Amino acid sequence: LLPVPYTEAASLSTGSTVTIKGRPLACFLNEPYLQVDFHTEMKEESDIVFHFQVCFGRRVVMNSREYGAWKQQVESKNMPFQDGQEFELSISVLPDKYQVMVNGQSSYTFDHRIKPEAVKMVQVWRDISLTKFNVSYLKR
Amino acid sequence: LLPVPYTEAASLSTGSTVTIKGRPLACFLNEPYLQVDFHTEMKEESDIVFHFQVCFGRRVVMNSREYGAWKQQVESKNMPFQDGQEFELSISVLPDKYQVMVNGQSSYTFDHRIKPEAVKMVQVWRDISLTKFNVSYLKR
Numbered sequence: 001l002l003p004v005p006y007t008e009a010a011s012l013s014t015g016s017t018v019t020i021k022g023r024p025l026a027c028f029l030n031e032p033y034l035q036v037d038f039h040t041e042m043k044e045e046s047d048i049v050f051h052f053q054v055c056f057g058r059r060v061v062m063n064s065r066e067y068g069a070w071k072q073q074v075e076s077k078n079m080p081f082q083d084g085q086e087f088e089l090s091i092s093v094l095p096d097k098y099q100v101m102v103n104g105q106s107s108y109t110f111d112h113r114i115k116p117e118a119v120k121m122v123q124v125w126r127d128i129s130l131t132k133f134n135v136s137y138l139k140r
Numbered sequence: 141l142l143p144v145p146y147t148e149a150a151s152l153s154t155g156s157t158v159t160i161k162g163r164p165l166a167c168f169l170n171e172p173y174l175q176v177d178f179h180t181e182m183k184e185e186s187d188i189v190f191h192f193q194v195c196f197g198r199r200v201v202m203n204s205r206e207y208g209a210w211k212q213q214v215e216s217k218n219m220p221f222q223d224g225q226e227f228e229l230s231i232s233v234l235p236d237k238y239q240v241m242v243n244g245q246s247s248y249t250f251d252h253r254i255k256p257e258a259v260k261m262v263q264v265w266r267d268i269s270l271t272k273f274n275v276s277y278l279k280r
């Protein structure tokens with residue numbers, strides 16, 4: 001297991017993929033959360049280019065935090081995550097948006113509000129255990 | 141540090157006190173949570189006689205979960221918790237209600253919906269680290 005909260009310095013651009021494998025720490029009846037934030041600095045209070053928050057079994061909210069203030073969230077009731085199961089998240093940086101795959105299924109997208117090149121850090125936290133975390137760095 | 145999620149088998153009655161010392165794992169801008177649940181069985185999906193959930197810097201909700209269904213929550217905007225600080229929670233079982241002290245200050249109360257003798261387990265979880273947990277057992 002990787003430590004949670006998990007923080008890794010990161011850079012992103014079109015073609016980058018962030019892969020996360022983990023499991024919720026509670027049954028869905030107890031409403032565990034999962035949060036992935038792409039930050040503009042290593043500091044936890046820095047701006048967030050992409051905030052992804054799952055309330056397992058209930059909903060997902062996505063937003064940005066710019067100059068310290070939250071912007072307009074996008075709320076989804078799509079819920080591909082399965083109660084009591086390990087999940088694999090694959091986040092792709094496409095030219096126009098982030099695409100979130102859950103267990104290989106396209107499940108959410110979020111249009112860029114800030115260039116992905118502004119990201120310097122990724123944090124994964126809340127009610128999960130993690131077994132894998134990777135940011136790909138294969139493209140120019 | 142005690143492991144989080146933290147679970148301890150427990151019994152409560154009038155005069156019992158549950159003491160918890162810990163710290164949030166994130167700054168308040170990031171909205172870390174704290175949850176304390178008094179359960180009717182050791183199973184995490186069991187009923188909850190007293191659910192106490194803090195969204196640090198924002199609000200507190202209290203409720204019960206009976207026969208698998210959440211009842212009517214009580215919402216408070218009282219926020220004695222301080223950003224970036226260790227806190228001490230003291231929960232007293234009074235004849236009529238639970239009284240929650242935060243850093244020695246009376247901060248929330250919740251009238252009994254189910255007898256406290258129905259409790260068999262206490263769970264402390266979400267975005268905190270813990271250094272102390274105690275249930276007192278000094279009274280008849």
Ligand SMILES: O[C@@H]1[C@H](O)[C@H](O)CO[C@H]1O
Pocket residue numbers: 053061062063070073171
């Ligand atoms: O998760 C964030 C925070 O709760 C913020 O306070 C409002 O926007 C939501 O998307």
Ligand SMILES: O[C@@H]1[C@H](O)[C@H](O)CO[C@H]1O
Pocket residue numbers: 031193201202203210213
């Ligand atoms: O925290 C609980 C859960 O969110 C439930 O779904 C509704 O009641 C709230 O108090």
